[PDB]
From a paper:
Stomatin, Prohibitin, Flotillin, and HflK/C (SPFH) family proteins are found in all kingdoms of life and in multiple eukaryotic organelles.
The closed and open PHB1/2 complexes both have a height of ~110 Å and a diameter of ~85 Å at the narrow end of the cage. Most of these interactions occur between β8 of one SPFH2 domain and ɑ3 of the neighboring subunit. The narrow end of the PHB1/2 cage forms a four-layered structure, like the Erlin1/2 complex.
Numbering used by the authors:
A (entry chain C): 120 to 263
B (entry chain B): 197 to 263
C (entry chain b): 151 to 295
D (entry chain a): 226 to 295
E (entry chain c): 151 to 225
Write the structure that this text describes.
Amino acid sequence: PSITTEILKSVVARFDAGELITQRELVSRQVSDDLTERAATFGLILDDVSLTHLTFGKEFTEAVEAKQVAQQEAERARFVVEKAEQQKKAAIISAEGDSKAAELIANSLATAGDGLIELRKLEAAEDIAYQLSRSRNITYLPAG
Amino acid sequence: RFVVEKAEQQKKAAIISAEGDSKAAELIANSLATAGDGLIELRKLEAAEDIAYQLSRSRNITYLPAG
Amino acid sequence: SQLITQRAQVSLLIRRELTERAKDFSLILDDVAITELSFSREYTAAVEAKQVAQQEAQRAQFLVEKAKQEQRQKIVQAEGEAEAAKMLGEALSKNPGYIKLRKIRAAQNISKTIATSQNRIYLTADNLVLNLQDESFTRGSDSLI
Amino acid sequence: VQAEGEAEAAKMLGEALSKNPGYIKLRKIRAAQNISKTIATSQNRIYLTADNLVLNLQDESFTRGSDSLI
Amino acid sequence: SQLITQRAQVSLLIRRELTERAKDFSLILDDVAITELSFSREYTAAVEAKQVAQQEAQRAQFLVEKAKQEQRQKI
């Protein structure tokens, strides 16, 4: 109950978490050396020294999981970029439609004037009043 | 010290992101220097529609008239 | 730090001193072991926070990898916007009337979106153009002369 | 370290925005959109101006955006 | 990633070292199988989100097809 404990705790203090996990064999071998040396003086002999379980604190494990999640999100960013390329194609097509529409309307209104805009404003006022008429969450207040 | 190491990685990431921002700004500046700001007005209208849609499901958003 | 990282040497020092003191009482020490060695709650939390910060610094390396993709995404989006601006600005330079028409349509669209929304909306009654005696009644028509 | 990053960013970004700062405006629009998403599911109480809905077509400011394009 | 995509090689390594260690106790290993290999909730969710993003990138291709029709409608 004493020697083992101390020896183990004395060897784990030689390594950090990364070394403890990725060099588990070296840690076990050093624990075995120390424990064999100490137990020889009590007439005992060790047939096997094994580090069977090795974990860390809650917060540290959360931090490690967050690091690996960040790696996965970096991987996901590539598919976000592919979506962005498709979005660029779609935006260019839609903008070509918008630009053709703007050219047509500009040619018309350069010589015609903005009468259509006023008429559309009145028709849209009627339509918008109709759209909002069924909503109880819409209130109309006078100007000011 | 580990906060400083995180800061160094953040500096690298900030430089890369700012390179992207600067290339984007160069492209858009070249386009708009001759085209004008029509795209900005169109995007404002489209964003008005989109933002109205985004906020439509929230009961904690209220619209009040100007003033 | 010394206590944790020199546990064996601390134990040996304790054993030497304890042997010297126990000889006077005719006692023999066969072994001395530091079985437990822990610290306060606050110090343990601070040590854990330091190691969490180390893991966060290691996590920040993947933010650079994500930043590369974000850079590419920004450039792609800007290329699309630059092309769109190029073609739309020439059309709108002659007459920006399309914007106005588009704006009207936007309003209509928004109205639909707002009809079924969960929001509380307080609109101005001027939207209803019901005050026919207002001085602003003729503004729209007056703008056409 | 942070200032080194910021200075490196500022050099190129300001060189780009000197010709035309329009990117900022576009970026701003996108920011608004992003914020809207963030605000949709938020726990805050938000009181916005109904001017965001561009529903007052007879308002004198209706033509401001288009008028700025002449 | 290596654990999942090299499960057979990891199993062979485990079997080799386990054979060497079990020889000392007069034990014979007939087979070693990694029957389960899973990760935390957060990592699994991140992987699923990455693949969802891949499917979203594939979905964005149809938004171009829709944009063509929207262009025609605008005109």
